[PDB]
């Protein structure tokens, strides 16, 4: 529950704010919990351990195709039932991918990473970078490279560097996202 | 209608039992989806051999006791009530017969003082109940009307939380169990009961796969 | 300057002075103007437990306070500035001079000196 | 009611307005009372935990697709009643979606997340940001970012000078915003 | 017209009972949408077995008493309006007959001093009421005209808040309950009454699913 | 009516101008009036009291499209007389818009708004910003970004010292507009 | 023409009863749109059973009294105009007959001292009024001319604000009530009266839905 | 209009009762905002069961006595004004009738020596008062004109400070109490009276919450 | 309304009992949030088995005694008020009936010398109290009206401080205890009473966690 | 809820045992997290073979003796309370029965002099206690009510500090031991007791790892 897999002490040690009384525990908790789902929704990976799923299925294409929604597991049969089946049928997925082949057609399986020793460092580094940006960079002034404040005489360049994911946070998490094809 | 999905027993995904809030007087419906546990076990799906059990984890024993009556067909029946509220302290006894939980095949006229007359409906023989309110405390009084010949037996004084005899069903084509969950008009707000459901599957040859789960029905007032 | 920079709430006070009958003298600070102003440091500060500054010259300004110019007021030699914060102990400044910024008569820049900053000063009356 | 969702001290500690009170608390709570009318007017979402909703649906898309105005939880089947229909139907939705298949035809279900509902902290960081940007942009200081590349057309200083987009809000509320 | 949605009993979504404002003299209509609760219980929808009950949580007892009379057909009826206002203090008695709540099949001539003449309409036999207002305090006076033969019975002196006997209905096609809520002209501003409704569903086999909710009628003045 | 919408205290505390007598109450009243006349004119929420109107209609199309100069008050019959009629006809408009569907033809509706309240926080924020602009940004010294100056050899940057668009409001009201 | 939209009694959207400005002498029109309230109650709309009532909230009693006369057909009528102004102080009596409110079927020649002759128009038998002005204060003087046979009865001395007996109408296709509101030339500027309207709807079977609203007629001068 | 906020009974934030300045002859209004006390008790807010009580803590007893007279309708009433001033010392009696507090439905002509003629306004039967001022000290004289038949009862001789019978109200939507405070013309400057107000809230089920507060009305002259 | 947070029994953070101020006549509300103690014990929260106890640590025993009388329905009742004040010294007895604490369903006429008539409200049978004030010191007199048949029992003479019988409740969803604290009009300013509350939580199987705390109510005057 | 972390037996990080403060009457919860000791011992965590022992280091022997009684079902039981206080000196005996620690299934009427009657709850047979307070010093009196057949045995006279028989539990996945620590109402403030906990882990094959630790329970009053 985010207390065991991201100790506030590690955050306070990363962003070097362990002596700031202007970042209370409740505020850091709000940051840590708004950034464990603003960059989990973005990657579509639950963080709890192996977590069973059940969902409907709609075949696509004349040669049959079953697009799932979890990238289920490595080596455990996903089973199909209902929908004109006379007996639950078991398919084996191929690692990483979430496509299969052969009164609504249902499917069940188990997604997630085996152990409780949860999300790898890649995910955590992104959060640490996102939190740090959030605590010492509120959205009040447009910035520029380094952190200078320019003029431009014309429109500022600050399309994003106001408060967006400029830190290598958002892109670190992406290393884990999956370009379709 | 409540909906619970069972843990599928994979070694994978505050208290033990999931929680069910109830209100005194309702009769609700509960649904549980055993698909996560009964699908991989390729067999004949579910069978109708569920067994339930209620036991209390908090009771707050009742103040007013219940009682039993009898009469023949058509003959009007009289009775008292005060003899059902042994009070420890000294106060008045504001008898009330709620129109919501009145009788079903008769009519009861409460007197001013622990008195009531139960006129049975013409041409009717069975059981009839009604729930009185002795000074906030609720109990039931049960009347059985006889077909003028011999005598009727004595029914079991419905409990605070019960599961009706046979209104349960399981759809083996989609692995879903449906049962009904009723709360008496007498269940005291704040109490908590426990419902344990033992649902059994079956393999292609007819052996068994048993499954046990529990729920915490907490009798709450106002929803 | 940026009107969102005037981010300090101060009370300009005048000093009223008289001797107590016992023989010693007493100073009262009465608040005259209340507004928003912007302060900025122009010299380091020596704190000396109890808060009171340890500046030796007592004539070199240490802070610059800018606020709305006000043509009817005369910031004299005897004006103070009481600045109150949220979770920081209050401060007392002593004005040392004023300058009408560019004589456009839109902002007064008060050259002042931090006297003391500790939780037990006497607020204005 | 708002200050229960967003205590004033959290606003102040985020936007650095502490030991340096800029605009007084009254203006602060006005800013808050306007920053909940840009958020949750820009998202479409409302303020109530784990609602169950009732609504009339239509069947445009002759094949028969249904578009709900929420996101039914995973597992709970939605029911369709009313209109030409013998008895309420049972459709189990697709996880994290609002597309379905097959005298006003109506539908009911349960939205939100099953557990406690605050206000998904994460559509609050924009509200904190939108507040922050409004404390040090009272409206005399010209700041303006560019949207287009080319120019205005005439000697106009580009333009997006809006706030809530120049502040990083629009792109932190967008994660809870459907793209159709 | 009021429209309420019921909580659907899912374990999901300042006082308990949702609120109803009412004005003395209005008669509105109330609509309750049981769709969220009875749609999942796939059965035969609602039934016409609703049960209503009115209870007061703050009443402000009336000052002026009501009264009852009788007359035969065609004959003029007389009475007083002065022994119905037992006043604690000393004050004058500005008797008044509001035209808004006058009689319905006759005429009344309020005398100078708590006197009045009810000339019943020719060729009419039933019950007829009108509402006098002795010093701001309103009460009702009910008169029953006989068809000259024996005697008519005595009607029940309509309460401050009531739900008419039979104007309720249920649309099993849309799971919507309709009933009427009428407020007497004697209801006193500031009071609060509590209405509890007990509605039963039914399964495809004909068993029962009960549902209980409450609403707090707050008698306000000026809407 | 405005004095209950914006109290001068809220202005003087937002624009951080309460200690300088150069911004008196008559001039700040002028500013607070010119910031409400352009709030209900770029957003169309009719902060003006009643203003009954009698104009001539020229029925336009074959679908019978009646167009109106100013919107009616959403619930009061717009009566048509003359133009051949001998019995004036009453129509009920659609709330928000100014379109109708049927010796010249005339119409006499009513406009404006009556009740005090129902002014959302979104609007006021825009109005506070607009005034905060005008109190310390007159029509001299065409500025540039971060309130700076310039010597751009070619020309200058233009449209910088026009209010309501350089600062807030134009964009803090768009949330109350449509297609 | 005044137009009010009534509150729909749904539980959502200075003093209570809304305002109507009126000027002494005018006779305007009022329209009330019960659409917001009666349209949801899908039925047979409004019915012509509206009821009105006028009440004073502040009156400022008149200084000059009104008076009543009688004459047969064709014969000239005489009267005096000085015993209708009981004056508290000593002042002169500038009797005046406003041309705007002169007679309708006769002619009046104001004398020098509170005297006047009303020569009725030939071949006319009915009721005739005119409104005099004794030193700024206005009253009415009503004369009834008889068709020479017995005697005419006595008309009711029109009140400051009234609503004509039968000029009301209701359009059930559009749920709009129309009625006329006439103000006597004797109304004193500054006063306020209270008009309450009790309108009944009707359901598809013929039952009743009542609705009450109040209005505050403020007699102002200069419109 | 005075506006007070009550202390909220939290155990947190010169004499006891807050102050109310009054001027003899005024009739002012007071508002008491219970929001700080009744809002936390989330329930049905206030009810209209307030109770007031007036006590004097410093009176400066009056010099001139009040008096009471009786007469029938239309008949002139006579009276004296000299036995209403018991004077201890030797001095003269400058009887006076102030025009501000003159009678309401008649006229009084002060004689040369404590004589006065109250000619009642024609066609009126009720009670009438006026406030004379025998040599700086003010008192009131009450007359009742009877409607020629029997007799009227006797009014209670309005006190220095009073809180009118029925002008109190409570808006449970915002927890605010409105009551009016009328001051006799005979209140002597410098005096102080004590008002204690007992207002009840109500919980969500109809129990009660009492609150007591006091106010010190200090009769000053000239504001 | 008072809001207390309990110490959490962690071994970390003048008297031990916290303080409550009260005013004679008020009836307030107290809220205790057991969240600090019952949340870690992850279970089913609080239960409705609170138990209260009132004890005095300073009493200042009263001067005037109370008394009890009896009468039937509708029949007028009399009594004396002078044997209730044993006075040690020599002084006069200013019997007084405060209008704030008068009776509820009747009326009393205080005589000149410790005599009084309680005419019960017509059509009423129960108990009624009223609080007299014999020379500053207050007591209560209780009368019970019987329904003309036998006799009513004898009520218990309300104490200086009490906690109403059944107005306590607990929200297991937020660990908050709500109860009422009502003080007699007789409690003497300066006294101090002690309240101990034994509140019992519950773990997930239904075992018990007890908690005790004490609160010192100090009867102060003027809040 | 107390939360202790055990020392990890590494040869690394006033008196021996850590402290637990307790209050007479409480029943608290203690949690001890053996993680720092059992985690490096990679295995199957804890087992349920914990054992406790209680020893007094300061006792302050009780003044009042305890006592035991016996009665059958339904029959009233009487008893004396004066031979339970051997007093060394001469004084009076103010017997008292605390409502906080009253009985559970009966009622007691404390007599005037060391006498009481314990009416057992109808239809009940078991053991039942209550705690008397003879002049400040507390003890218990134990009664066992028998189901009319033979006799009940004799329970063991609960000690001051005890650890319930079976309410200990341990979660092997996170190395946490839970147990309850309940204090009798007879524990005299100022005493100190010592709790020694012997907890066994287990390696991966089923061998054992024992651990011993102690706690110093300090009975304090006012928390």
PDB file of C-alpha atoms in Angstrom, chain D residues 10-178:
ATOM      1  CA  UNK D  10      -2.125  22.058   1.765  1.00  0.00           C
ATOM      2  CA  UNK D  11      -2.773  24.778  -0.812  1.00  0.00           C
ATOM      3  CA  UNK D  12      -0.394  27.076   1.019  1.00  0.00           C
ATOM      4  CA  UNK D  13       2.354  24.520   1.534  1.00  0.00           C
ATOM      5  CA  UNK D  14       2.257  23.564  -2.136  1.00  0.00           C
ATOM      6  CA  UNK D  15       2.292  27.084  -3.581  1.00  0.00           C
ATOM      7  CA  UNK D  16       5.086  28.237  -1.242  1.00  0.00           C
ATOM      8  CA  UNK D  17       2.760  30.827   0.250  1.00  0.00           C
ATOM      9  CA  UNK D  18       3.798  30.184   3.809  1.00  0.00           C
ATOM     10  CA  UNK D  19       5.980  32.413   5.950  1.00  0.00           C
ATOM     11  CA  UNK D  20       5.212  34.830   3.148  1.00  0.00           C
ATOM     12  CA  UNK D  21       1.501  35.210   2.877  1.00  0.00           C
ATOM     13  CA  UNK D  22       0.592  36.677  -0.450  1.00  0.00           C
ATOM     14  CA  UNK D  23      -3.112  37.310  -1.050  1.00  0.00           C
ATOM     15  CA  UNK D  24      -5.124  36.713   2.120  1.00  0.00           C
ATOM     16  CA  UNK D  25      -7.045  33.558   2.989  1.00  0.00           C
ATOM     17  CA  UNK D  26     -10.319  34.966   1.665  1.00  0.00           C
ATOM     18  CA  UNK D  27      -8.915  35.367  -1.832  1.00  0.00           C
ATOM     19  CA  UNK D  28      -7.356  31.951  -1.398  1.00  0.00           C
ATOM     20  CA  UNK D  29     -10.699  30.268  -0.843  1.00  0.00           C
ATOM     21  CA  UNK D  30     -12.198  32.238  -3.726  1.00  0.00           C
ATOM     22  CA  UNK D  31      -9.407  30.917  -5.946  1.00  0.00           C
ATOM     23  CA  UNK D  32     -10.247  27.455  -4.653  1.00  0.00           C
ATOM     24  CA  UNK D  33     -13.962  27.969  -5.343  1.00  0.00           C
ATOM     25  CA  UNK D  34     -13.107  28.856  -8.930  1.00  0.00           C
ATOM     26  CA  UNK D  35     -10.476  26.151  -9.464  1.00  0.00           C
ATOM     27  CA  UNK D  36     -13.109  23.473  -8.913  1.00  0.00           C
ATOM     28  CA  UNK D  37     -15.194  25.013 -11.706  1.00  0.00           C
ATOM     29  CA  UNK D  38     -12.416  24.664 -14.264  1.00  0.00           C
ATOM     30  CA  UNK D  39     -11.408  21.228 -13.122  1.00  0.00           C
ATOM     31  CA  UNK D  40     -14.468  18.964 -13.130  1.00  0.00           C
ATOM     32  CA  UNK D  41     -15.935  21.210 -15.778  1.00  0.00           C
ATOM     33  CA  UNK D  42     -13.026  20.381 -18.041  1.00  0.00           C
ATOM     34  CA  UNK D  43     -13.044  16.700 -17.113  1.00  0.00           C
ATOM     35  CA  UNK D  44     -16.799  16.123 -17.103  1.00  0.00           C
ATOM     36  CA  UNK D  45     -16.537  14.060 -13.916  1.00  0.00           C
ATOM     37  CA  UNK D  46     -18.623  14.955 -10.859  1.00  0.00           C
ATOM     38  CA  UNK D  47     -18.228  14.905  -7.055  1.00  0.00           C
ATOM     39  CA  UNK D  48     -19.786  11.832  -5.458  1.00  0.00           C
ATOM     40  CA  UNK D  49     -18.222   8.502  -4.430  1.00  0.00           C
ATOM     41  CA  UNK D  50     -18.987   5.227  -6.212  1.00  0.00           C
ATOM     42  CA  UNK D  51     -22.330   6.239  -7.656  1.00  0.00           C
ATOM     43  CA  UNK D  52     -24.820   3.985  -9.367  1.00  0.00           C
ATOM     44  CA  UNK D  53     -26.440   5.684 -12.325  1.00  0.00           C
ATOM     45  CA  UNK D  54     -29.576   5.357 -14.433  1.00  0.00           C
ATOM     46  CA  UNK D  55     -29.796   6.743 -17.945  1.00  0.00           C
ATOM     47  CA  UNK D  56     -31.512   6.287 -21.313  1.00  0.00           C
ATOM     48  CA  UNK D  57     -29.235   4.857 -23.982  1.00  0.00           C
ATOM     49  CA  UNK D  58     -29.602   4.956 -27.760  1.00  0.00           C
ATOM     50  CA  UNK D  59     -28.574   2.529 -30.484  1.00  0.00           C
ATOM     51  CA  UNK D  60     -26.869   4.616 -33.134  1.00  0.00           C
ATOM     52  CA  UNK D  61     -24.394   2.438 -34.927  1.00  0.00           C
ATOM     53  CA  UNK D  62     -26.959   0.096 -36.498  1.00  0.00           C
ATOM     54  CA  UNK D  63     -24.812  -2.957 -35.749  1.00  0.00           C
ATOM     55  CA  UNK D  64     -25.673  -2.206 -32.142  1.00  0.00           C
ATOM     56  CA  UNK D  65     -22.912  -0.530 -30.149  1.00  0.00           C
ATOM     57  CA  UNK D  66     -23.857   1.118 -26.853  1.00  0.00           C
ATOM     58  CA  UNK D  67     -21.881   4.050 -25.465  1.00  0.00           C
ATOM     59  CA  UNK D  68     -22.244   4.608 -21.741  1.00  0.00           C
ATOM     60  CA  UNK D  69     -21.520   7.891 -19.988  1.00  0.00           C
ATOM     61  CA  UNK D  70     -19.380   6.280 -17.287  1.00  0.00           C
ATOM     62  CA  UNK D  71     -17.051   3.311 -16.788  1.00  0.00           C
ATOM     63  CA  UNK D  72     -18.707   0.220 -15.300  1.00  0.00           C
ATOM     64  CA  UNK D  73     -16.506  -1.614 -12.845  1.00  0.00           C
ATOM     65  CA  UNK D  74     -14.828  -4.842 -13.885  1.00  0.00           C
ATOM     66  CA  UNK D  75     -17.037  -7.848 -13.257  1.00  0.00           C
ATOM     67  CA  UNK D  76     -20.314  -6.295 -12.234  1.00  0.00           C
ATOM     68  CA  UNK D  77     -22.828  -6.926 -15.038  1.00  0.00           C
ATOM     69  CA  UNK D  78     -24.880  -3.978 -16.213  1.00  0.00           C
ATOM     70  CA  UNK D  79     -28.602  -4.501 -16.736  1.00  0.00           C
ATOM     71  CA  UNK D  80     -30.806  -3.219 -19.549  1.00  0.00           C
ATOM     72  CA  UNK D  81     -34.519  -2.761 -18.959  1.00  0.00           C
ATOM     73  CA  UNK D  82     -37.355  -0.862 -20.560  1.00  0.00           C
ATOM     74  CA  UNK D  83     -38.232  -0.595 -24.203  1.00  0.00           C
ATOM     75  CA  UNK D  84     -38.710  -3.678 -26.276  1.00  0.00           C
ATOM     76  CA  UNK D  85     -37.314  -6.275 -23.887  1.00  0.00           C
ATOM     77  CA  UNK D  86     -38.880  -9.284 -22.191  1.00  0.00           C
ATOM     78  CA  UNK D  87     -36.840  -8.986 -19.010  1.00  0.00           C
ATOM     79  CA  UNK D  88     -33.720  -7.156 -17.793  1.00  0.00           C
ATOM     80  CA  UNK D  89     -30.595  -8.363 -19.605  1.00  0.00           C
ATOM     81  CA  UNK D  90     -27.169  -9.206 -18.167  1.00  0.00           C
ATOM     82  CA  UNK D  91     -24.118  -7.878 -20.021  1.00  0.00           C
ATOM     83  CA  UNK D  92     -20.682  -7.982 -18.413  1.00  0.00           C
ATOM     84  CA  UNK D  93     -18.657  -4.996 -19.636  1.00  0.00           C
ATOM     85  CA  UNK D  94     -15.182  -4.883 -21.030  1.00  0.00           C
ATOM     86  CA  UNK D  95     -12.681  -3.882 -18.322  1.00  0.00           C
ATOM     87  CA  UNK D  96     -12.022  -0.157 -18.294  1.00  0.00           C
ATOM     88  CA  UNK D  97     -14.330   0.718 -21.173  1.00  0.00           C
ATOM     89  CA  UNK D  98     -17.842   1.844 -22.018  1.00  0.00           C
ATOM     90  CA  UNK D  99     -18.646   0.069 -25.292  1.00  0.00           C
ATOM     91  CA  UNK D 100     -21.264  -2.679 -25.318  1.00  0.00           C
ATOM     92  CA  UNK D 101     -23.213  -4.805 -27.793  1.00  0.00           C
ATOM     93  CA  UNK D 102     -26.317  -6.999 -28.077  1.00  0.00           C
ATOM     94  CA  UNK D 103     -40.701   2.405 -24.128  1.00  0.00           C
ATOM     95  CA  UNK D 104     -37.341   4.093 -23.687  1.00  0.00           C
ATOM     96  CA  UNK D 105     -34.461   1.631 -23.408  1.00  0.00           C
ATOM     97  CA  UNK D 106     -32.579   2.373 -20.192  1.00  0.00           C
ATOM     98  CA  UNK D 107     -29.502   1.021 -18.438  1.00  0.00           C
ATOM     99  CA  UNK D 108     -28.134   1.041 -14.890  1.00  0.00           C
ATOM    100  CA  UNK D 109     -24.815   0.024 -13.363  1.00  0.00           C
ATOM    101  CA  UNK D 110     -22.178   0.982 -10.793  1.00  0.00           C
ATOM    102  CA  UNK D 111     -19.418   3.422 -11.712  1.00  0.00           C
ATOM    103  CA  UNK D 112     -16.268   4.602  -9.943  1.00  0.00           C
ATOM    104  CA  UNK D 113     -13.853   2.365  -8.143  1.00  0.00           C
ATOM    105  CA  UNK D 114     -15.243  -0.018  -5.565  1.00  0.00           C
ATOM    106  CA  UNK D 115     -13.180   1.362  -2.717  1.00  0.00           C
ATOM    107  CA  UNK D 116     -12.952   4.711  -1.007  1.00  0.00           C
ATOM    108  CA  UNK D 117     -13.279   7.752  -3.278  1.00  0.00           C
ATOM    109  CA  UNK D 118     -11.534  10.959  -2.466  1.00  0.00           C
ATOM    110  CA  UNK D 119     -11.120  12.889  -5.715  1.00  0.00           C
ATOM    111  CA  UNK D 120      -8.552  10.711  -7.413  1.00  0.00           C
ATOM    112  CA  UNK D 121      -5.572  12.643  -6.137  1.00  0.00           C
ATOM    113  CA  UNK D 122      -3.934  13.387  -9.429  1.00  0.00           C
ATOM    114  CA  UNK D 123      -6.802  15.412 -10.617  1.00  0.00           C
ATOM    115  CA  UNK D 124      -5.879  17.660  -7.731  1.00  0.00           C
ATOM    116  CA  UNK D 125      -2.298  18.457  -8.651  1.00  0.00           C
ATOM    117  CA  UNK D 126      -3.663  20.584 -11.443  1.00  0.00           C
ATOM    118  CA  UNK D 127      -6.027  22.282  -9.019  1.00  0.00           C
ATOM    119  CA  UNK D 128      -3.076  22.995  -6.749  1.00  0.00           C
ATOM    120  CA  UNK D 129      -1.170  24.161  -9.815  1.00  0.00           C
ATOM    121  CA  UNK D 130      -4.065  26.237 -11.127  1.00  0.00           C
ATOM    122  CA  UNK D 131      -4.295  27.893  -7.716  1.00  0.00           C
ATOM    123  CA  UNK D 132      -0.539  28.442  -7.614  1.00  0.00           C
ATOM    124  CA  UNK D 133      -0.441  30.057 -11.041  1.00  0.00           C
ATOM    125  CA  UNK D 134      -3.267  32.347  -9.975  1.00  0.00           C
ATOM    126  CA  UNK D 135      -1.500  33.572  -6.863  1.00  0.00           C
ATOM    127  CA  UNK D 136       1.403  35.114  -8.791  1.00  0.00           C
ATOM    128  CA  UNK D 137      -0.457  36.054 -11.974  1.00  0.00           C
ATOM    129  CA  UNK D 138      -3.025  38.614 -10.852  1.00  0.00           C
ATOM    130  CA  UNK D 139      -3.400  39.893 -14.392  1.00  0.00           C
ATOM    131  CA  UNK D 140      -1.150  42.845 -15.111  1.00  0.00           C
ATOM    132  CA  UNK D 141       1.933  40.859 -16.134  1.00  0.00           C
ATOM    133  CA  UNK D 142       2.024  39.879 -19.801  1.00  0.00           C
ATOM    134  CA  UNK D 143       3.000  36.215 -20.083  1.00  0.00           C
ATOM    135  CA  UNK D 144       1.978  34.374 -23.228  1.00  0.00           C
ATOM    136  CA  UNK D 145       3.106  31.050 -24.657  1.00  0.00           C
ATOM    137  CA  UNK D 146       2.732  30.122 -28.325  1.00  0.00           C
ATOM    138  CA  UNK D 147       0.462  27.424 -29.735  1.00  0.00           C
ATOM    139  CA  UNK D 148       0.983  27.753 -33.455  1.00  0.00           C
ATOM    140  CA  UNK D 149       4.412  28.033 -34.989  1.00  0.00           C
ATOM    141  CA  UNK D 150       4.008  30.439 -37.897  1.00  0.00           C
ATOM    142  CA  UNK D 151       2.977  33.791 -36.453  1.00  0.00           C
ATOM    143  CA  UNK D 152      -0.149  35.583 -35.569  1.00  0.00           C
ATOM    144  CA  UNK D 153      -0.667  37.135 -38.935  1.00  0.00           C
ATOM    145  CA  UNK D 154      -0.131  40.627 -37.837  1.00  0.00           C
ATOM    146  CA  UNK D 155       2.170  41.994 -35.180  1.00  0.00           C
ATOM    147  CA  UNK D 156       0.267  40.175 -32.453  1.00  0.00           C
ATOM    148  CA  UNK D 157       2.149  38.532 -29.637  1.00  0.00           C
ATOM    149  CA  UNK D 158       1.239  34.938 -30.500  1.00  0.00           C
ATOM    150  CA  UNK D 159      -1.065  33.608 -27.932  1.00  0.00           C
ATOM    151  CA  UNK D 160      -2.180  31.080 -25.422  1.00  0.00           C
ATOM    152  CA  UNK D 161      -2.302  33.349 -22.395  1.00  0.00           C
ATOM    153  CA  UNK D 162      -4.907  31.282 -20.597  1.00  0.00           C
ATOM    154  CA  UNK D 163      -3.694  29.670 -17.431  1.00  0.00           C
ATOM    155  CA  UNK D 164      -4.558  26.133 -16.418  1.00  0.00           C
ATOM    156  CA  UNK D 165      -2.646  25.206 -19.591  1.00  0.00           C
ATOM    157  CA  UNK D 166       0.338  27.495 -19.117  1.00  0.00           C
ATOM    158  CA  UNK D 167       0.412  26.115 -15.572  1.00  0.00           C
ATOM    159  CA  UNK D 168       0.579  22.403 -16.328  1.00  0.00           C
ATOM    160  CA  UNK D 169      -3.041  21.760 -15.388  1.00  0.00           C
ATOM    161  CA  UNK D 170      -4.697  20.782 -18.685  1.00  0.00           C
ATOM    162  CA  UNK D 171      -2.024  18.111 -19.137  1.00  0.00           C
ATOM    163  CA  UNK D 172      -2.439  16.732 -15.623  1.00  0.00           C
ATOM    164  CA  UNK D 173      -6.233  16.559 -15.668  1.00  0.00           C
ATOM    165  CA  UNK D 174      -6.129  14.923 -19.116  1.00  0.00           C
ATOM    166  CA  UNK D 175      -5.269  11.509 -17.795  1.00  0.00           C
ATOM    167  CA  UNK D 176      -8.894  11.196 -16.614  1.00  0.00           C
ATOM    168  CA  UNK D 177     -10.284  12.555 -19.891  1.00  0.00           C
ATOM    169  CA  UNK D 178     -11.718  10.402 -22.669  1.00  0.00           C
TER     170      UNK D 178
END
